[model samples]
Target chain A: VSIKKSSGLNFDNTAIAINAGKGLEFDTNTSESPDINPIKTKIGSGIDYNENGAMITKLGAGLSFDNSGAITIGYIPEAPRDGQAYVRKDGEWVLLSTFL
Target chain B: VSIKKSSGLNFDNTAIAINAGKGLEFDTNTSESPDINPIKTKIGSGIDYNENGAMITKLGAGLSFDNSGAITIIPEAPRDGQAYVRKDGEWVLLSTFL
Candidate 1:
């Protein structure tokens, strides 16, 4: 749960705070961009360069988002047959738990 | 908390098990790399092809590594700042909650 390699030996920026599940493997480790820029694709929300510090708009109807990003799954499209997990309480969508 | 597109439609490799606060966005989607590979720098530890499944070697003083890889930050040099933190009890340097 720990590994923070700051500033690539000398050139500069290497910034890492490992907890990634192995997800960010970019190959070729050089660092010290000297200001070349242009990589950001916008995971947008803000918690400083966010890789997953935090970001989740409206998990309301059991996960939602549509500002042109398109994602409206209010549950019950019927996909959960054996994995079971529907929870919505008073609005009606109950199957509860079975990720077994 | 839902969106597991499986099998990139037909070409075959588009595995996604999302929960990443809007992460993993690789535009121009297409998968199934018939057999063209070579990308592994090394984070070593394991739990299946791992992308955070696991990896760490000697967080002794609160984080360390060196077989020539070099990375030893025992935490200390932090005065009027609110960044960089890694607490491993008492090798010294302690004061954080963020």
Candidate 2:
């Protein structure tokens, strides 16, 4: 009452798993359509890189600390110093440029 | 056979839920023992929300927010080279070029 073989064909579970899985791509049909890779592509598109086209023009922000009396994140320095932060010296609350 | 028992009631679960025979069971599998464990959430330091109003929890020093959770920099007294640090919810000055 059970089937071991039909004609000369063996029951191959691997062939069926390849068609339904995302691991291996033996052919065009093997990678399993709408797998999470395409969804991952859409998810990664919203990220902001650490270094990219950036400017905050309520005044401006910089790496070399140019002062238009604007607010900035910080600056880079030589090998022996910590990161430098700079707020303009003219404000009710000032965050001036100094290494902390 | 002894002809002494009366024909009163001898039946089974005729009306069942899955249209099959079953009754309410107890804490066997992932069953109802610790009923309705709400799994209360734990949050870290960050912003929270409310209906157009909020109170900021753990507001750092020299910083503030209205109920809208909109952040504002709380100003301090002007000192030339001294800086402000928050001890609890109040401001204390620290000298940078001391």
Candidate 3:
């Protein structure tokens, strides 16, 4: 396996291309925004703007937004468990395997 | 395929492992530090300690440091593209494809 870097880079309002094989590819277009933008709490691996690229994180369940634009995550509630973020549109977790 | 979560977690000093087929694996050992810490103006996707794992962003070219402690990046004069960061010190672009 080889790790190759692309000469392409951008911030917020950025995009990425993921392909399976034989020219089958899809463009993941997203308007860049901080994980918790419009307000600053404690930002995590969720997302950030950098030179190499951007990091987009998934929001786990039990977290909801209030009408005022505030975000919240529920407590762990259980041991030996980590909360997971559901993928957009589909209830799938954004995984490395997906290369999303 | 299914997505699994590991309740195991930590911060400050952290680490992750990328595994291949069966038992073969390797740990991507990295210290948790700001892409340019000891000083900060604007941070990027590079690295940050958050609820999720952490975003360790990669730095690109034309950038170097000074003795006293400061950071700098060369301007992107080429319009058609951007610069790339060398992975670790192996002279590789931390890429995606396997």
Candidate 4:
């Protein structure tokens, strides 16, 4: 199930994706063509956009990348429990605090 | 028209709603059935969910509900204007400060 540049996208599956070197952008009605400075997702970045916002649900236990190019996530918990906030440090999960 | 659990959802109207006691959830393919711990919206909370974020656009002047359940909103302005940003304790027009 490959999607080409000229092809329309209409799928009902759980996963739809683009290749690593490619990007995804949208066309606005201000012009018949795409915007000259159209919003674009960076190549090789694992980001997903939706109607109103971007979803970071794909982020695993210890993963995050911010706009400043700083990337990191909370360290994974060995004895995992609900309502705990963890942070990633030196490629491992460390308990930050408990909310509930 | 009212939608039942078994019926499909398709509408072109300005607003679609669920009853106070009901919730909206999505299904994942990991199992043919819906997730046992499906995400849910709180009952009686005027919140709306979209593909990416939850919108609190329903909040009017002087209204907000923090996670701690402390609900409040800024005071409404007496004089209505386009660029005025009214504060809760102040009555001066924002342009007056300029």
Residue A4 lDDT in model 4? 55
TM-score of chain B of each: 0.16, 0.23, 0.18, 0.21
* Candidate 2 Cα errors over 4 Å, as ranges: A1-100, B1-34, B39-42, B47-57, B74-98
- lDDT string for model 2 (A1-100, tens) is 2333332112233211111122111222214322211111000221211222111122123221133322223432212122322333333223333434
User: What TM-score fits each model?
Assistant: 0.15, 0.17, 0.14, 0.15
Model 1 chain B scores worst on lDDT over the 10 consecutive residues at: B2-11
> Distance from true position, residue B40, model 3, in Å?
21
TM-score-superior candidate, 2 or 3: 2
- What is the DockQ score of candidate 2, to 2 decimals? 0.01
Candidate number that wins on DockQ, 1 or 3: 3
Worst 10 residues of 2 chain A by lDDT: A35-44
Best by lDDT: 4
Residue A83, candidate 1: how far off, in angstroms?
Answer: 50
Candidate 4 residues A18-49, lDDT tens each?
11223333323223233121223332343333
List residue ranges in candidate 1 displaced over 4 A: A1-31, A43-100, B1-31, B34-98
- For candidate 4 chain B, the 10 contiguous residues with the lowest summed lDDT are B16-25
Cand 4, B chain, TM: 0.21
Using TM-score as the measure, name the better of candidate 2 and candidate 4: 2
DockQ score of each predicted structure, in the order shown:
0.01, 0.01, 0.02, 0.01
Candidate 2, residue A45: Cα displacement in angstroms equals: 15
DockQ of 1: 0.01
**Ten consecutive residues with minimal summed lDDT in candidate 3 chain A?**
A32-41
Alpha carbon lDDT at A28, candidate 2: 20
**Per-residue lDDT over A1-100 for candidate 3, one digit per residue giving the tens place of the 0 to 100 score:** 2212242112222222111233111222223222111111123444433343333233346543333323333411111113322122253323222543
Quick one: best DockQ, which candidate?
Answer: 3
Candidate lDDT values, in order: 0.28, 0.26, 0.26, 0.33
